[PDB]
Amino acid sequence: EMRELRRQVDQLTNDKARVEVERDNLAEDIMRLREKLQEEMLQREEAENTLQSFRQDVDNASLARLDLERKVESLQEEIAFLKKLH
Amino acid sequence: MRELRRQVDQLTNDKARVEVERDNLAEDIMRLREKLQEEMLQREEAENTLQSFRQDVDNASLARLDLERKVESLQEEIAFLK
Amino acid sequence: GPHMEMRELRRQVDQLTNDKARVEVERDNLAEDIMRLREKLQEEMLQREEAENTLQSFRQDVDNASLARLDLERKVESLQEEIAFLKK
Amino acid sequence: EMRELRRQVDQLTNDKARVEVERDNLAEDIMRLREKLQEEMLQREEAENTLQSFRQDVDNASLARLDLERKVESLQEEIAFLKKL
Amino acid sequence: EMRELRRQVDQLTNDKARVEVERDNLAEDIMRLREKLQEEMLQREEAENTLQSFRQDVDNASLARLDLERKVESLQEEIAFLKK
Amino acid sequence: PHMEMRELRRQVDQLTNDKARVEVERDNLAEDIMRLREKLQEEMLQREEAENTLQSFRQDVDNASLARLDLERKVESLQEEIAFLKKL
Amino acid sequence: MEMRELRRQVDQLTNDKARVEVERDNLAEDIMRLREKLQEEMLQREEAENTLQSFRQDVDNASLARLDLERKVESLQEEIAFLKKL
Amino acid sequence: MEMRELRRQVDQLTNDKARVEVERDNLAEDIMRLREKLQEEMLQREEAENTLQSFRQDVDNASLARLDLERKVESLQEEIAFLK
Amino acid sequence: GPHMEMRELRRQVDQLTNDKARVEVERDNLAEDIMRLREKLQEEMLQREEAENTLQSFRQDVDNASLARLDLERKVESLQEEIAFLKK
Amino acid sequence: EMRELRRQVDQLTNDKARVEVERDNLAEDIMRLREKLQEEMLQREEAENTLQSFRQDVDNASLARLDLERKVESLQEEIAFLKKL
Amino acid sequence: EMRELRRQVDQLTNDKARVEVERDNLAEDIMRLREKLQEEMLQREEAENTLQSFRQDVDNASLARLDLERKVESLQEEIAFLKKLH
Amino acid sequence: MRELRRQVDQLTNDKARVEVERDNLAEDIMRLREKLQEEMLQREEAENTLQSFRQDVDNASLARLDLERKVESLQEEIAFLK
Amino acid sequence: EMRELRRQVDQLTNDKARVEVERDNLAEDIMRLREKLQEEMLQREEAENTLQSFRQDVDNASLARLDLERKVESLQEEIAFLKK
Amino acid sequence: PHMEMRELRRQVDQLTNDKARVEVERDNLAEDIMRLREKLQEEMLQREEAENTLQSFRQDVDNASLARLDLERKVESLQEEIAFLKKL
Amino acid sequence: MEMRELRRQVDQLTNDKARVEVERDNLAEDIMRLREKLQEEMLQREEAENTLQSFRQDVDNASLARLDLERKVESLQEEIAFLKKL
Amino acid sequence: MEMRELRRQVDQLTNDKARVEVERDNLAEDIMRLREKLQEEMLQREEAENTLQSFRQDVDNASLARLDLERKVESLQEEIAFLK
């Protein structure tokens, strides 16, 4: 039993050592992962902000077109009426 | 003598604590890769949408020329009409 | 002649007026609905973070309880080994 | 006058167009907002569920400890008895 | 007369020597056997306590599976409502 | 020679008394071992049955776990379907 | 694109399932080898203990034989000692 | 249509992975238990092989001593026969 | 284990104590018996020497008595010879 | 403790051994002494017997003398008578 | 008778002379014998005294041996108990 | 004349006295040879007994060496045992 | 007448001479005989006195032999006691 | 011649008287010797018988002496046996 | 050693018995020779006394014969003396 | 066993010596008595042989005297015959 006790001490110490190494490698991995996550969050917000701003010029472009189509439609109505003096 | 049984008790508790640390690091990492991907996901969605809007405004700038041209054509017509 | 063309013009003016009026009402209700929702969202974000922080804090309580139990169990097994060795 | 009627149609057309863009943007924003709100309610419910789970775990563990502390003592007693021969 | 006595002391010395080996073998074997009995009773007690712990886990899971099953159906009712 | 006879017979009676005493002790131990073997055999059988019952119930634990997991996957999946339908 | 996210989880789940299966496979192989060694160690243990129990008889006989001779020496020395007088 | 198939895939894969992780977890717990038994088995075998070699040594020692005591007995008997 | 070896040791201590106590009592009775006997011996030696000295002294009394008788007998025979010669 | 029990057995063994030697020497001395005492009683009895024997011899001799002295005188008488013729 | 008387005187004188010679030779013999007797008595007492003294060292030698045998017996008991930790 | 009968009387008594002296010398000598022999006897007994004891102590001095050796052997054994 | 007388004196002288020799021979022989008678009576008296002295010696020895015989038996009884 | 005759007859008568007296004396002595011889013969016979009886009784004396001696030897021998048995 | 003392007295008693027997033997031989001389001396004594008693007769006759002659001389001288006168 | 034979030997030898010493003592007392008789015997024989030689001498003397007296008688008778 006194030789078996020391056998347990040696095994447990070696197992603690292995778990400690693994936690250390995981602690480094998580540190790197958080930095990357913060980097993507910032890049994600920038893309969403640029898209939200660009929505304004999409609408103006659409309103500009609508404005011209109505202009054409109205001018065609006037020509049709002027020609109708026959 | 009886230090051997104490060392095994104390070692068994420390290993137990480190294995809790390890397993909690593994769980947080799993959650951190999930969120990272949700983030890249939402970003690529915005990049793709914006790129599509860009191509839309560009096309519309061309198409506007043609409308501005048809317009003018029609003012001239009215003038030759009046 | 121009009477009818006038008639169709006046019909278009009225129709555009009713349709514009309807779309504006709809725009007003949406803007008000968004204000209520933003307020609601801010409230839900705050509750969600507090719960997650409280969950993160309690995880220590879980680990400590679990290690405490593990330590006692090792203590039981060890005492039993000491009984076994004393009997021999 | 037709000139004034026709410009009224023109001006109403544009103005309607612009309120419709405004309408559409608000709807799109309402939908994203509702979708965000849903994801936050889910995330909170899940945190609250896991927490109640952990709380029962801590409670079981605490009562288990109570029984184990009593077994420790009984075994100390036994060791002391054995020690006195 | 004296020789017969020296015989009997000799013979009893050996006979006692032999029974003492018999006794000490019985007592050793008894010690091993009480040791084994105890290990078996411990091992059974651990098996029983762990089983009972698992049984509580399964009883809980049965109640928790009812909550999950009920959430499932509410959600299907919601997809149905959305689909009309 | 008288005294030597006295010491000889003294050794005989003592050795007789000690052999007799050790023989009684051997007999009591022989009885104890028989009952103890019987007890050990019974306890081995009960231990094996408890471990067999534990080993079989492990399946019940796993199926309970998988059933829950399947249900949890189902909940989140139905929720994803709802979120997609709402954005249509 | 919800489809983009779905196929993304399908691929991840496939790689994750494959990795767990590899781990489960190695454990099953490891378990088979370990059971075999256990059966061999149990067989060797039972044979050693049986041989030990049998040999205990030889130890007892040997010790009792020596004890007999020692008593015989002591008895003879008493006999010579008495002859030296009467 | 294609979407419904993808989400069914994800669910089937989630449950199949779940089942394989339960299998893995149970294999790890078994292997640990088997490693423990194996240690206890070699332990007892080493202890038995150690006692046996110890007993072999005591037999041999008793044998060498018996050899030597047989001759002291022989000498002491001749002494006596000369005396008587 | 050590319990039994302890038990046999304590049995040996008690047995040696009773046996030592018995031998000492026997030693005391013998030492006292020797004192009485030495005293007795001294007395018998003294009486034996006095008797032998008294025997040695009385031997003269025997010799003198015997020679006295012998002298008278010679005197009788001589007187008878004188009577015989006177008658002749 | 076994160490103290075992030294107690050792010390009792030696001490018993020494009292037994003392016992045996006293017995041997008692026997020689009794054997001496016997030889002295015999020697005295024999001296006393021979003495009583001698005493009867002296007594017989003394009474014999008495009778012989009377025979001497009777013979003197006879010689005197013969002398006077 | 007067010639017979002188014959008795001569014979008795010669007989007295012979008895006197014999007593004289016996007186010398007894003197020598007493001296020898005293010499043997002294030598006898010296032997008995030397034997009585030597009895002490016989016993000590015997007690010394007993002491060593018990020592061996006790040491063998201790070894047997230390080896019994199996 | 009558001196002859007196001389025979007186001589007969003297011879008688010397023969008593002689016979008493013979008796004492017989007793003195008996005691002398008892003395030599007791002496030779002591010389023989002592000689036997001597040979005993000498043998025991040898045999003691062997016991002192077995002893030591066993102390070493215990030490290698502890 | 005178011659006859001288004859008778002569004859009587010789006859007396002869009877006187006869007498003196008888008286001498009587003296020897009284001498012998006395020696015989002395020798008988010595024999009788010595015999009587021997008879007392034997009577004493008879009583003394009883004491010795009694000591013998007591001593045999003592050997018997010692032998058990 | 007358006187010579007177002296002659005087010698005859005296010689006759003396012869007569001596003859009487011889006769008385002859009688005495006969009785004396008879007495002597009787006394010789009694003396021889006394000496014969003494000579025969000497045997009785010796046997008495040897009997005692044998008994004395027996006593000391039994005593030696007792002394040897006591030292065993 | 009581046996040593016993054989010691046996040997002494044998030598002492032998010496007494030699003495008894010489006395028996001496007695036989002495008896013979005694018988011879008795025979010579009786013959001398018998011859003496017989010769006493010759002595008496011789003396009486001489006495007769002396008386005869005295008587004759008386006869001559008387013849010388008447 | 051997001891019992030795002590019986000593006793038999003691009694046989005793008997021979009685024989010796009786022979010495006899020889002394025989020596005395022999002296008394030669004594009387010498006395008788001495008297006889004395008587022989007196006879011879008486014979020589008778011879001489016969012749004085012869002379005195012749004287008388001459006278008458």
Swiss-Prot record, chains G, O:
Instruction: Quote the protein name from its UniProt record.
Output: Vimentin
Q: Which organism is it from?
A: Homo sapiens
Give the gene name.
VIM
Where is this chain's protein located in or outside the cell?
Cytoplasm; Cytoplasm, Cytoskeleton; Nucleus matrix; Cell membrane
Q: What is known of its domains?
A: The central alpha-helical coiled-coil IF rod domain mediates elementary homodimerization.
Q: At what positions is N6-succinyllysine found?
A: 37
Q: Which residues carry this modification: Phosphoserine?
A: 63, 75
Q: What is the lineage of its organism?
A: Eukaryota, Metazoa, Chordata, Craniata, Vertebrata
For this chain, the Swiss-Prot or TrEMBL PTM comment says: One of the most prominent phosphoproteins in various cells of mesenchymal origin. Phosphorylation is enhanced during cell division, at which time vimentin filaments are significantly reorganized. Phosphorylation by PKN1 inhibits the formation of filaments. Phosphorylated by STK33. Phosphorylated on tyrosine residues by SRMS.
Tissue specificity annotation: Highly expressed in fibroblasts, some expression in T- and B-lymphocytes, and little or no expression in Burkitt's lymphoma cell lines. Expressed in many hormone-independent mammary carcinoma cell lines.
Family membership, please give it: Belongs to the intermediate filament family.
UniProtKB/Swiss-Prot annotation, chains H, P:
N6-acetyllysine modifications at: 17, 37, 72, 84
Compartments, record wording: Cytoplasm; Cytoplasm, Cytoskeleton; Nucleus matrix; Cell membrane
PTM sites of type Phosphoserine: 63, 75
Q: What is the effect of changing residue 57 to R?
A: In CTRCT30; uncertain significance
User: Any idea what this protein is called?
Assistant: Vimentin
Q: How does it assemble?
A: Homomer assembled from elementary dimers. Identified in complexes that contain VIM, EZR, AHNAK, BFSP1, BFSP2, ANK2, PLEC, PRX and spectrin. Interacts with BCAS3. Interacts with LGSN. Interacts with SYNM. Interacts (via rod region) with PLEC (via CH 1 domain). Interacts with PLEC isoform 1C. Interacts with STK33. Interacts with LARP6. Interacts with RAB8B. Interacts with TOR1A; the interaction associates TOR1A with the cytoskeleton. Interacts with TOR1AIP1. Interacts with DIAPH1. Interacts with EPPK1; interaction is dependent of higher-order structure of intermediate filament.
Q: How are the domains described in the entry?
A: The central alpha-helical coiled-coil IF rod domain mediates elementary homodimerization.
Q: In which tissues is it expressed?
A: Highly expressed in fibroblasts, some expression in T- and B-lymphocytes, and little or no expression in Burkitt's lymphoma cell lines. Expressed in many hormone-independent mammary carcinoma cell lines.
Name the coiled-coil region(s): 3-84
- Which residue ranges traverse the bilayer? none
